[PDB]
Design an enzyme around this catalytic site. Structure first.
Site, PDB file in Angstrom:
ATOM      1  N   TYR A  50       9.643  28.541  31.637  1.00  0.00           N
ATOM      2  CA  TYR A  50      10.709  28.686  30.648  1.00  0.00           C
ATOM      3  C   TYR A  50      10.206  28.529  29.213  1.00  0.00           C
ATOM      4  O   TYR A  50      10.575  29.299  28.330  1.00  0.00           O
ATOM      5  CB  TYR A  50      11.835  27.681  30.910  1.00  0.00           C
ATOM      6  CG  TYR A  50      13.102  28.020  30.179  1.00  0.00           C
ATOM      7  CD1 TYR A  50      14.030  28.922  30.721  1.00  0.00           C
ATOM      8  CD2 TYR A  50      13.379  27.456  28.929  1.00  0.00           C
ATOM      9  CE1 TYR A  50      15.206  29.249  30.038  1.00  0.00           C
ATOM     10  CE2 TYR A  50      14.545  27.781  28.234  1.00  0.00           C
ATOM     11  CZ  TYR A  50      15.447  28.676  28.799  1.00  0.00           C
ATOM     12  OH  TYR A  50      16.608  28.983  28.107  1.00  0.00           O
ATOM     13  N   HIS A 120       8.763  34.849  34.572  1.00  0.00           N
ATOM     14  CA  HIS A 120       8.861  33.394  34.517  1.00  0.00           C
ATOM     15  C   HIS A 120      10.103  32.909  35.229  1.00  0.00           C
ATOM     16  O   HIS A 120      11.094  33.641  35.300  1.00  0.00           O
ATOM     17  CB  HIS A 120       8.948  32.914  33.078  1.00  0.00           C
ATOM     18  CG  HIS A 120      10.330  32.990  32.517  1.00  0.00           C
ATOM     19  ND1 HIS A 120      11.255  31.974  32.681  1.00  0.00           N
ATOM     20  CD2 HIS A 120      10.958  33.974  31.824  1.00  0.00           C
ATOM     21  CE1 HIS A 120      12.392  32.333  32.100  1.00  0.00           C
ATOM     22  NE2 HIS A 120      12.238  33.541  31.579  1.00  0.00           N
ATOM     23  N   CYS A 121      10.059  31.676  35.751  1.00  0.00           N
ATOM     24  CA  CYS A 121      11.294  31.000  36.152  1.00  0.00           C
ATOM     25  C   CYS A 121      11.368  29.664  35.386  1.00  0.00           C
ATOM     26  O   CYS A 121      10.966  29.620  34.236  1.00  0.00           O
ATOM     27  CB  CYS A 121      11.361  30.851  37.662  1.00  0.00           C
ATOM     28  SG  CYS A 121       9.948  29.970  38.369  1.00  0.00           S
ATOM     29  N   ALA A 122      11.860  28.575  35.955  1.00  0.00           N
ATOM     30  CA  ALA A 122      11.949  27.360  35.099  1.00  0.00           C
ATOM     31  C   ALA A 122      10.588  26.679  34.963  1.00  0.00           C
ATOM     32  O   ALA A 122      10.062  26.578  33.875  1.00  0.00           O
ATOM     33  CB  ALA A 122      13.064  26.361  35.561  1.00  0.00           C
ATOM     34  N   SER A 128       9.044  32.973  40.171  1.00  0.00           N
ATOM     35  CA  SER A 128       8.136  33.880  39.460  1.00  0.00           C
ATOM     36  C   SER A 128       6.807  34.044  40.195  1.00  0.00           C
ATOM     37  O   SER A 128       6.271  35.148  40.250  1.00  0.00           O
ATOM     38  CB  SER A 128       7.871  33.327  38.078  1.00  0.00           C
ATOM     39  OG  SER A 128       7.594  31.944  38.190  1.00  0.00           O
TER      40      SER A 128
END
EC number: 3.1.3.-
Lengths: 181, 172, 179, 181, 172, 179, 181, 181, 172, 179, 181
Positions: A50, A120-122, A128
């Site tokens: 993130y 991307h993820c968190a 991701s």
């Protein structure tokens, strides 16, 4: 004598490679640690978290796309980056296999056109990671590429510190890209 | 080891990418071949009164012991279970001995304290020695994980695994 | 045992015993099989004794594992402490003496039974037990006490700290430097 | 890689065996220690000490005979064991060679008939050890069986802790069973 | 070594079953072959003034020294006399050197401090190297015990004996 | 020697000597042959000196053997002490200092001549002798004394504690940590 | 396995010799230390220092000649030794090459006639060392004897502690005896 | 734990480390001499060097007003402002240099007050030049006892440059002038 | 290495008899072959921004590190720079790797902390491996001294030199 | 940093931070590039930082080199101290703690900037810096302080004493045995 | 010297050993996560487990009255008396579990008083179930300071089971509820 890098391998010392893979494969793996910086996995495809997405506007890489795999939509204030939202849940009950073909095809396009994209993820590990892993597997053409899967998996995990720890995600990648294809 | 490929390959791959259960100490003896058993120190003490008629026990702990009322022959190789100790220097002699035991149908218990690392490595070495392929990576992973699943813990010591790999997989 | 009667049981029988035992009339080492209760709460045993601790009549709170192998005891509510020790003539074990005797001592103070073991229950565990016994002695140069405890214990178990390096270290720590 | 046992050897690792024998044979031997329990040297022949003789009645082994080699006669109160007294002196001046043929022949009979016999003296080392050693040598058929003698001697000494330490007894066994026969 | 068999075999057997005298320090030099002598540190210091005209002294102590007024060549190999030290790594070079000395008729003293363990092992290695039989166990025991009887003490260090056995008897 | 005259013999000759000797004007090492009497009762020698101790004019009561080899002296009534030491740059010898100096000191108190030797009589035995000499000094940072004793002793014998690790350990023990 | 001595070598263990020379030749050399006793370099030729010259009269060697290479003339009181004075300066500007042929020829004569000669300067290292080195090189007959030069140089330096440290002297010996001849 | 440069760090640094270093240095744990290459700034304005250093003085960052040449040969520096004082000395053990001390140290002392950079050199930069620099450093000594300061300066200077007044006669003269006196 | 003999032989001989400059730490990278460079830890950090396009860096320090923005592959072999450590066990693998780099024209920096001992030995081993003569003593001295003169310091560690000599000069 | 505000900055933010960081929510190790000023005068850096010390704006008087490689800095007037350390899980570094902290402490007293480095500037140098920081703490069992200093420092540099044996030794020395 | 079971051994055991263990654990010396297999008795009546454990609850020696199911799927247990309370939770970093704490801990608390065995489980027995058990254990904390107790419980529980509330969001919520609060 293993060469830790960024993004070939059919020429690196084979005994070194095999010893590494077999050790990693029988329980000799580091504890998971969060990634911090983006990893350039391809000429144009990056994997990140993130925070990496928030810094994308001011990166030396001139990103055209960001794939947001979190549940939350955001905008990037002074940027012409196209943010595509594919919201996913990071748990052991969700099917991500339905996303694979579409996401690898898109990323593949980003590389053909030389348009950098950040996925991307968190935390930059499971949602991701799985898309990136799918992408790398999609480029392979052998019939049962188990070695290649282990090599990509472990060397990406060692590089980033954590990479598709979600066992259900790994299972799905295996069925799609190694077992039956 | 020629079963249902897809299931096997799936299991190996999950096992090889970190899907492993937390180590459990084994309690019972495992028969690995026709004559060769793997076990812990209690299994060793119980050897004389066992249905199996062992002629040999191979003690890999650091402690000598005797089994007075039995007719078992005890071989003692004191090994250190740590990460700097060389155990490869014993592979050939131990696998030749275990191989003799299977030829002569003479049952043998190999054991250490908990029956996981020193004894496990010797067993793993033995199983690997019976394999004639040039690069038996699948077979190595298969044996390793199936043993660990059967016993609950098996060659958890990474140095021991490294030595087996060097001797039996990546030289060969 | 009967260390309380040192200064006090029949001297002729006792000195004949210590003196013959100390000039080479010792029995061939024999592996123990059963636990020995050395103290109100401290027991000495081998690895099999350890596996049987949960179902022993004595309600063990602790097990001190001195082998190189970690194990667990799932059904039990026993706490396991692991100090992996080497049984050879070069390793130093004296660095663990204070911590281990302090701990065993505490189990006695609190009446919490503890089993100390290695693989065969002779050397690594024997030495810790011997350290503990010696730490309870308060005299200046307790030669008589050392010989009595060593030989009684060896007669009772069949074999006890056969490792000469372990004995040396116990002598250095508890008999020769005191006050 | 030497196999310490109870009672073959033309098949155990030869290099291991030889190294063991040659080390024992050039001064690398434990100090003598008294035996405590009986040793079953044959299907039916046991070697023991005075204490072992006192406990023979209540042994799981159903002994028919005890050879008492001490100077003192004793009886065994609630037992049908036949106690045969062959009194011997344990020193360096006494001839025991005259006893060999008779004692091995008897023990040999005990094994044919499966009738357990305990041979013991006071400490279970010299008088009884020598008879047992004679018995084991009598079963060998080679012409100059030096290896077999060393193997039996040392492996029996390591097992029991002390075994025919009396040099005059050893000499006599050598002349009878190894040198000329 | 082809003498009166029965007496020989009797002596070996008694010697091999524990009939050994308590070790005595040797004082005089022993001529083991035509050119090769065994001795202690004093023998080394006395070398220059000896009837024998040594060209070489092989010093196996841990201490360097010189013999100023002599024309002797000193070779120094510092060895540890304990039970964990590997001395086999020197056998071939030392026996080849000692062998050169006997070919060229060039007298050589091999010594250590007391002239028992380090120097003795090198001598024992040398004598064993001259033997061409496949399993020279009798010859080993014969040389070992006759040397010990002649000198009063000889390779008392069990590790050194083990290494000689491994190199010269049980591999071969 | 003449350590009693430290503060007191001709300074110009002495400092020229210590200072040249301390800045690289030292002679090539030469093996000793004869014993040197360092103290009323303490002698330093090599292995040959040890073999000749029985028939020496000095009535030796003790010999301290610092080689790795045990020996006996049958005809003599000399007592032999064996401390097998390694002469290399890694072994620690400082752990023996207190015991050995205390012992040598006692031989001096009781006038019981003792010979300390190794093989060549330079390093292992040299170091123990140097330890002993230094233990007799009472000053705070006895640099002058250390240099004088080392070089005099080396000039007199031809070679003396050439092992730099031994020197370091002696410096650590007796010159830098005192009061 | 190198044999440190006094004064052949085409028979000592070659691998040992080479390892020694190559180590000495690449910077593994002891710090210089003054010699103390004379060194007999030949049947009759000795190398020594000023002190050695003072003690020559009472030496067991019956010297006939002493070559004094210092700047100072001296006599030897109760002696029939012939003291020949060839004064040299020990620095990096003086030519000693002009002395070589005469000095080696003389020493060579001393060996033919078995008349011991001591060559010495003050410390017994450079002026005298160079003459002795010249003498030893003069006896060699190969065309480019580099090995022999290294062997003599290092083994003489290790024996004495210091030997022709004067780089200008060494240079001159090299030109005369190794490079062009 | 002892510290190496030039440029007091002495009545200041850890004393145990100091004494340990000196005492080891003084009892023969010294490196074999190796020749200096670059100049050493010994003081605010005074530099020690060799011939090559002297030639490179005009091209230096350091604005030199003086160069002190102790070689036998007079030389000029092409077009440079530097004043080349020439004081020829012989590098051997027979020459008095003590008579030059006071003048050379007074001159050096002057250069430090009027902040005028100076390069003291001979051919190799070891003995002649070293001796003048050592004398200078002793002349400035006002805080610590000469004996300890002599050793400290000698050894740290030698460790820095690789070789430093190796000439024992020069060391002696300095001792007589600055330590005994 | 076939130049003006007399000058060469003169230089070697002076160099070999003690005429060596005091060690200077190198600062810049040295190109030893077409693709193989030698350098220190700073050269390693500067690798990504260098005119040379390295594909590989071989880190011989004891410390792991990464070069995030580069596409360089880092190989880590932690070596001890002391006198008792065996480095010969790595020679063949390292020279085979460096040899691969030169065949494929793939630039590689080999480095340690100061770029003198561990990295230098590996470079020296590499250069020696390319030599096919039976006893390359001159070539060894030539390479050693010319490298030391070029860099200012080069394999000052005598144990490392001993190991190179053993592997590449006096066995061969 | 902000160790002065330990007892005093927002507890909810701080404990959430230490507690997540202490139960496995740590970032993957990242090599540092820039020096970090840990104290008024003490800096932590890597080997490149060391090469750049002469031309740094901070006027370094000392550099403490903890790699195995000696180097010099010719143009500078910096003093270099070399303590060659091994980075492995078996070497003992605690024997250098007192000397190094005493020295760093002295640089702070005298305002003489010093750079401490190894190759990458994470483990050997990190440990010495951590030792120094801990030696300044005066509390009895400074757990909070240890955790804060370790994690802040690691967040700031990217990687800091990843060697678990080094951490253990620092814990043994500065947190568990005090008063 | 730290001791491993379940079942306080804390304000009781060697403190040095305790702090050493925690401090090592807390600064990154932690094992890689591995999945639990058997149940853990955390308390007199409260057990932690996984799905498989839940199915085996009827066949257990433990006489369970309750099983707390935190997976998304309702299930029944064939013929068993056990009452299966269902509270479905999502194992990700976006879900609030804090709102369930008080009720779940009160329920668990009740089970311990009325001595009624209870099994708290989710799919793998790591996050959801772990979090409730951790909260429970913090709710019972009345003797030691929460910060140290949190770490002690977290690490010893994780060492025992192999993995234990690895979910950082769940750890955070617990910290906010039981440590900060």
């Amino acid at each position: 004598h293993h060469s830790s890098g960024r993004e070939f391998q059919g020429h690196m010392d084979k005994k070194s490679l095999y010893k590494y893979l077999l050790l990693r494969s029988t329980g000799d793996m580091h504890r998971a640690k969060s990634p911090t910086i983006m990893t350039r996995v391809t000429n144009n495809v990056y994997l990140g978290n993130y925070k990496n997405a928030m810094d994308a506007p001011s990166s030396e890489v001139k990103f055209k796309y960001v794939l947001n795999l979190t549940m939350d939509k955001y905008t990037l204030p002074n940027s012409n980056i196209n943010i595509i939202h594919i919201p996913l849940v990071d748990d052991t009950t969700t099917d991500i296999s339905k996303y694979f073909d579409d996401v690898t095809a898109f990323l593949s396009k980003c590389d053909q056109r030389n348009e950098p994209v950040l996925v991307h993820c968190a935390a930059g590990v499971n949602r991701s990671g799985a898309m990136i892993l799918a992408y790398l597997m999609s480029k392979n053409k052998e019939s049962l590429p188990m070695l290649y899967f282990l090599y990509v998996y472990h060397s990406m995990r060692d590089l980033r510190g954590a990479f598709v720890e979600n066992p259900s995600f790994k299972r799905q990648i295996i069925e799609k890209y190694v077992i039956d294809k």
